[PDB]
Design an enzyme around this catalytic site. Sequence first.
Site, short mmCIF file in Angstrom:
data_model
loop_
_atom_site.label_atom_id
_atom_site.label_comp_id
_atom_site.label_asym_id
_atom_site.label_seq_id
_atom_site.Cartn_x
_atom_site.Cartn_y
_atom_site.Cartn_z
N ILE B 91 -75.68 57.47 54.08
CA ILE B 91 -75.74 58.06 52.75
C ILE B 91 -74.44 58.81 52.51
O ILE B 91 -73.95 59.50 53.40
CB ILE B 91 -76.95 59.01 52.59
N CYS B 92 -73.86 58.65 51.34
CA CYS B 92 -72.77 59.49 50.87
C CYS B 92 -73.33 60.35 49.74
O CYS B 92 -73.53 59.86 48.62
CB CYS B 92 -71.58 58.65 50.42
#
Lengths: 74, 200
Positions: B91-92
């Site tokens: 996840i960013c």
Amino acid sequence: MQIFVSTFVGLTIMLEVEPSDTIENVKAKIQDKEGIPPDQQRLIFAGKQLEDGRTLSDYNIQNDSILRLVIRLR
Amino acid sequence: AANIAVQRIKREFKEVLKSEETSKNQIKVDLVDENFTELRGEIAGPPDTPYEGGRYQLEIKIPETYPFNPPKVRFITKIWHPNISSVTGAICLDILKDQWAAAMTLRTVLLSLQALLAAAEPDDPQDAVVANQYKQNPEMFKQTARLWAHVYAGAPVSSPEYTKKIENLCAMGFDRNAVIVALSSKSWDVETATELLLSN
């Protein structure tokens, strides 16, 4: 006093209980919240299976203790 | 474990269980075993997005230093989104790296991850391939994401074109998910997708 019940594979609930509540009282509560019949239900605490006659204190089940629920396939 | 960490996770776990958002089947938390160190999260796809109707399982690990470092979160469910790796689920999102605050919660992380699905930020990309398709051909991204939403997250049926090319190539002996990946990442060019698949 509250406890956690989980299958660990997609069911996790929290129940309000007292130390004097029996394992049968708990499975009834599970049936009320999730609809699983108590004959279908297996509850285990620290490896040892739980028998419907004893109470939570008998097994030393404290606040925030985690109980594993197994649903037998029928 | 630090008492601050376990007390806080327990309280935040309970809070999510009792939440309204859980009552409306929007987020949920589960135990995976008798500890609070690893949790399993679940978010419903936001409405009016390709993820609608889908549900996304989340691997959630609580570091020893909680609440002063964020939980480690990854999608277990595969998803086509610019800020989530289509391969690993990484996840960013700023609140999981440099914008964490100690007052944030399990609840708050889950609803932020849901908001991320409804509001992709493609110039902070995680998946370059997804983010370029997002920017260059929006309708294909939308239909690809809806397709991933359908095959991986239980959303209802996606565009039948994509289902066609997936059929043609699945007949040639390739693994079905390998075909989905191959076709998606090569922007449904049946040629280059077939050339990539042959190197397996």
